Amino acid sequence: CTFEYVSFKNLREFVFKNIDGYFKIY
């Protein structure tokens, strides 16, 4: 595989973007 980075009261907001092939998580 290319890479393996294995590392209602609660609310979670996520932003997913893949620009220039770079994947960004907020």
Added chain:
Amino acid sequence: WNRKRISNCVADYSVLYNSASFSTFKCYGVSPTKLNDLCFTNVYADSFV
């Protein structure tokens, strides 16, 4: 023949570039001194007897 891939590091090639105690070591395709001052997408290894 075995194929190995290396990824996700900083390639300090100077460890094997400064052995100088190896029988026949030839680097074809890159300047080894500037290899530590250049960048690559992947690092593979193939070995045969």
